[PDB]
């Protein structure tokens, strides 16, 4: 029963090197709890979960200061990179940062993350040992040389193994009724004829949390992969998720096919056959 906290930073530059757009979000597993938007009026770290509004004003102050500090640093790097790659002054360019930590059931540190991207492709990443970097080409190679000589990975490791783990447990405890719960999926099957010889059996899974789910078809007990469609897990907008799997079956053989659903909230994996 491991849990995760993840932060996603995004800095998009404006034409003429104007004030760039900065958006930051925070997640505990698949639940967003904080957000920041430079286009928002408050210009503050806003809450996005019921259990995070419990934090006092000292929390929202320091969290607003630290996300501002990173955005201003991404703003300077965006201009430095635009002149490095001689990129047009009338375009937009993006710097993304993803970082977080993993804890086990006992609440101890499992693994850390810290990696950046420029214009959609990997820039520099903190390796799993939290002591070395994996950088891309050219401009990223200067960053790797710069961060190695400054021992920058030491304080990055200190946050991921320290403040990240400490506050992830606090969030998991303050919102245990939201984060440590598993909402099982509500399953059913639909039938959609294609012609007089074929038809589509669609197997639904609605309102489940977390998003990790597995849908598989079978024919006479054997794994059926031929003529199978599977859409990505989509958000329902209420905190839960949706996903369905389809298969084209010949007419009169619908009951030969069974849908199998695996989810954390299910004590036993479900099996659905057309009735």
């Amino acid at each position: 029963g491991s849990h995760s906290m993840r932060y996603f930073y995004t800095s998009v530059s404006r034409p003429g090197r104007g004030e760039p757009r900065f958006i930051a979000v925070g997640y505990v597993d698949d639940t967003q709890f904080v957000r920041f938007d430079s286009d928002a009026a408050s210009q503050r770290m806003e809450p996005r979960a019921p259990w995070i509004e419990q934090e006092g004003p000292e929390y929202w102050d320091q969290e607003t200061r630290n996300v501002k500090a990173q955005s201003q640093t991404d703003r300077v790097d965006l201009g430095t990179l635009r002149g490095y790659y001689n990129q047009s002054e009338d375009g937009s360019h993006t710097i993304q940062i993803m970082y977080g930590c993993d804890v086990g059931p006992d609440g101890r540190f499992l693994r850390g993350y810290r990696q950046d991207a420029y214009d959609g492709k990997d820039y520099i990443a903190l390796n799993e040992d939290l002591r070395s970097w994996t950088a891309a080409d050219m401009a990223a190679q200067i960053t790797k040389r710069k961060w190695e000589a400054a021992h920058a990975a030491e304080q990055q490791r200190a946050y991921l193994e320290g403040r990240c783990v400490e506050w992830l447990r606090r969030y998991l405890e303050n919102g245990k009724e939201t984060l440590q719960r598993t909402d099982p999926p509500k399953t059913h099957m639909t039938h959609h004829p294609i012609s007089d010889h074929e038809a589509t059996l669609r197997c639904w899974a609605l309102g489940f949390y977390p998003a990790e789910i597995t849908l598989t078809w079978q024919r006479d007990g054997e794994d059926q992969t031929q003529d199978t469609e599977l859409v990505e897990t989509r958000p329902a907008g209420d905190g839960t998720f949706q996903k369905w799997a389809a298969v084209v079956v010949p007419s009169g053989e619908e009951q030969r096919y069974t849908c199998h659903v695996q989810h954390e909230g299910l004590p036993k994996p479900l099996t659905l056959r057309w009735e």
Binding site: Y7, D77, Y99
Partner: peptide, 10 residues
């Protein structure tokens, strides 16, 4: 709580 160590890439 967000990252408090702000690194300049260049």
């Amino acid at each position: 709580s967000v990252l408090n160590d702000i690194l300049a890439r260049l």
